[model samples]
Target: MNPPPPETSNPNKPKRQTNQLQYLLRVVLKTLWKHQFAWPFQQPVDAVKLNLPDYYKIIKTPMDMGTIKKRLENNYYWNAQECIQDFNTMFTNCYIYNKPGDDIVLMAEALEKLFLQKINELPTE
Candidate 1:
């Protein structure tokens, strides 16, 4: 028979829980970007400009590489699935733009898919 469930503390205190998967994802992506060979972009591509602006006429906050990198650093411990979702959304929104189609978009799409697969391969403890 399975052992009895572990006992719980009486007074619960809120604690910050880090999602290991998310942390790893950020680290991997950051490292890849830092290492020019793995970065997948030859020239600077403003991904944010490609985004669709639903409310306004144009995109208010353009998502250039610097801005994206900053956001990644700011939210290092975000949910892995959510992070992947955001990347996928950005890819889909930007794919139609002719500028990125030549190389950047294709590479980004491939890398995103690879990372998602990697995340899935991780053990779910």
Candidate 2:
């Protein structure tokens, strides 16, 4: 059930051979961005326009996929845990603001599971 372990690090590394964790996260983010389920999570919930000005009051830090991507690209993340926590924050905010039994929240769960699913598809942490 396991493969041999003499893998050379040169070619096995990500393109640019920069940061392996960053590259891995970029791959997951691409999958996330391509899915339609992330439509609501692409950006921050518009407070004034979306008529949820109070959302900010309840959810201290509003995290979104696009913003996460921006942060990753800007090299804001120094550790994988930081990135994962941002993702967790987004999901938590979703559950807090939306009805847990409703469709939006259902899709939010889907996105949540999908992220973990993709993350597991990797070599794992």
Candidate 3:
């Protein structure tokens, strides 16, 4: 499905990147909206109708990781590693890890070192 267009234009922004990010954001938001849209149709509607919207707003919408995982499991998924890698990539890209022009390889190395240290220090049975 096509995403909604942005609400405003910025003179200095890179159009391609901005459009890509907005598309991703819209997909996430739409997924959230769809989840909440079912409230009234379900039984005990009052129990869900009011709070669902609030819960939806506070929790990550559109592409909820919990919901996604549930669906994947229910469908007998085999792409667990791919899912993790994609999620990490999305997070890193959105967060601009190490910032522009920074050495990402070095940052990854540092993170790996930290992870190894923590793992090594953990209690073993």
Candidate 4:
């Protein structure tokens, strides 16, 4: 077999560093969505039907740390606001797909509680 030519470019380029707050925010939201949909039990057929849209919007959404940082300044309040917006987007999309009901109400309440707790823990200023 013929030998391959040497590589021309750096294969181990450094990854862009994400800010602590940005990283933590993504982690928290991703974890919450996963817990809500994919934990312990497999999602029910009807539950999957109700949650698919929001799942895609929340869990499958890309984490653009750069954009997240730029859109909201590096502060607890803004980070909390951004996270709340994410939750609202998912909640609204779910509602549109399935309309208000018990499951949806429960999810909203759970998300609100967790999000508020996370916001309180985030660093201020």
Candidate 5:
């Protein structure tokens, strides 16, 4: 069986970046593994019923990074930028534009904050 979801924010201790990424990845991967990754995009309730904001929309944007690169020479381009772009697009569509009486400026700030939080939570691996 899978574990419970982690908290997004803490009152006492600030959340680290790696923790956020691991949290996000764990959430996304489990959803994908269970429902084949497509259904959740079509209907996100099955995946984000508890964590995300209500009325949020999910879009399926899969990545394909062909072949592993050599690491001994100190080279790494993980296509993380592409993933970030896709995630940004989906988040913007869902919260920034779709909500009624939503504040775009605040949304933008939150998006940036979340991105930063996720980055900090990423593992060194």
Candidate 6:
């Protein structure tokens, strides 16, 4: 058997780096969490306290900003798309639960637009 010399062109840059997708996500999330219109979506719906007894019955999976935030902190999302998926779920939940023309649902619609716009600012590919 013939032996070949090892390759030595493994290039590495040693700098503290943040994940591109995660960095983008962090930016978007901060905007969402601090937005004036985000109040309604900022936390999990308190089904019992809000007297929304049927909320759970209507929405099988209740997703919210609070949950997403915690999940982000815990690094539960496998990819940027997963994080975005959670946002979609949260908005879709609101859309399904509230009247289409209602303010709450409108907020959902608006936020969704903003979310996508912010995402577009990133290099999605």
Top-scoring candidate (lDDT) = 6
Steric clash pairs (candidate 3): 28-62, 31-62, 32-62
Summarize candidate 2's per-residue lDDT along 13-85 as a digit string, tens digits: 3422135347545787888888778898887777776777677777766788877777666556656666778
Q: Rank the candidates by TM-score, best first.
A: 6, 2, 1, 4, 5, 3
lDDT (tens digit, per residue) of candidate 3 on 45-108: 1215344434323323122234333333333223333333433432343234234445543443
Order candidates by lDDT, high to low: 6, 2, 1, 4, 5, 3
Error of 2 at 93 (Å): 0.7
Clashing pairs in 1: 48-63
* Best of the candidates, TM-score: 6
TM-score, every prediction = 0.47, 0.76, 0.23, 0.39, 0.29, 0.78
Report lDDT per candidate. Answer: 0.44, 0.71, 0.33, 0.43, 0.36, 0.72
Any residue pairs clashing in model 6, and if so which?
none
lDDT of 1 by residue, 11-87 (tens): 24322224544454466456445643335332224334534234123323222233344444555324556445545
Clash count for candidate 3 is 3
Candidate 3 scores a C-alpha RMSD against the true structure in Å of 17.7
lDDT of 6 by residue, 3-48 (tens): 2211112235222223744664478888887877898887778777
Candidate 5 achieves a global lDDT of 0.36
Candidate with better TM-score, 1 vs 5: 1
Error of 6 at 19 (Å): 2.1
Candidate 5 TM-score, true structure as reference: 0.29
The number of clashing residue pairs in each candidate reads 1, 0, 3, 0, 6, 0
State the weakest 10-residue window (summed lDDT) of model 2. Answer: 1-10
Comparison by lDDT, 1 against 2, better one: 2
Off by over 4 Å in 4: 1-20, 23-27, 38-80
